[PDB]
Amino acid sequence: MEMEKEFEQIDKSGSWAAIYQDIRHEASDFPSRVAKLPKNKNRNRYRDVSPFDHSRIKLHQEDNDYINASLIKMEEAQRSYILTQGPLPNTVGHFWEMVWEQKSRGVVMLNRVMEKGSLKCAQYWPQKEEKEMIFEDTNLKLTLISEDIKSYYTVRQLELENLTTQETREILHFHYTTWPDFGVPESPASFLNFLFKVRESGSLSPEHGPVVVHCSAGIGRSGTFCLADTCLLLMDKRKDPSSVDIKKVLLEMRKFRMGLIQTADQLRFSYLAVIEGAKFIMG
Ligand SMILES: Oc1ccccc1CN1CCOCC1
Ligand SMILES: Oc1ccccc1CN1CCOCC1
């Protein structure tokens, strides 16, 4: 069923809460035993947001391989994403170890460091060229190379050095800075423009490891970003773009990480974003 007429229909009947609860009831439940081990309590931001065992990213070390991060592998679309929490003071070294080990070219950040007067993630990248960061626990160095500040997003070029081998790589930091403290954006236009900038960078392409995507918990805004990207690619792959079922794609992604899309308003915004992104690509 075409999504745009459908959208107006779901609006007219005011049933977003009921649709969202149907998704919550049908979502996968898989074990997260590693996340819940007592030795990992200070590696989780939120007690109710954990990676499944089957899809968790493992750190390459014998001591403790745990990070709150999941591999979302979309078979038909041929896209993969790592979705992770905003890094904590004691996991900033693990975060950059993961980017290094997974061969990622891009990090996508959808939150501010402070929102609602509280800290939503650590200041995990350097703010000045001449003040680099060293992560002694994982033996990495990170340098700010350049910063481009725009009205709706900032893009940074970073240099990550593995101090063990003296190898270096160029990481692109895509920072969406305008998501409102409460609710969702009124228009999806700036979010869709941002998605198009990440795509045009090569960060989502199969010659690199998966993009790393985060917000504060790594399920709400982060879920909206991957859901919109996969749905729009499927529309360009299929003979019938109207066959793409956003609720079925979201339930496929929920096989790999719990809780993706945290509210009925985020569900509406995703449908909104896919509907408006379809129109712009059309011709
Ligand atoms: O290298 C890219 C290619 C396509 C898109 C984006 C980038 C990253 N740029 C951000 C700041 O300007 C120089 C690098
Ligand atoms: O790439 C195209 C060119 C002309 C017409 C249609 C498409 C497919 N779009 C459908 C809407 O969703 C994104 C792809």
- Within 6 A (CB) of ligand 2 lie 232, 235-236, 241, 278, 281-282
Which residues, listed in sequence order, are joined to residue 74 by a DSSP beta bridge?
A: 79
The atom number, within ligand 1, closest to the CA of 147 reads: 11
Range of the domain at 102: 1-283
User: DSSP character for 133?
Assistant: E
Resolution of the experimental model, in Å, one decimal: 1.6
Contact 96, 214 (CB under 8 A): no
Distance of CA 49 to the CA centre of its chain: 14
Q: What total number of domains does the chain contain?
A: 1
Task: List CB contacts of 13: < 8 A, sequence separation 6 or more.
Answer: none
Residues at the annotated binding site for substrate?
Answer: 181, 215-221, 262
CA distances from 279 to 32, 155, 164, 225 (A): 40, 26, 49, 18
Nearest by Cα to 55 from 263, 261, 252, 230 = 252
Nearest CA residue ID for atom 7, ligand 1: 201
Task: List CB contacts of 240: < 8 A, sequence separation 6 or more.
Answer: none
Q: Which two tokens stand for residue 269?
A: 């915004």
Cross-sheet strand order for the sheet of 211-214: 69-74, 79-84, 211-214, 106-109, 167-176, 153-162, 140-149, 133-135
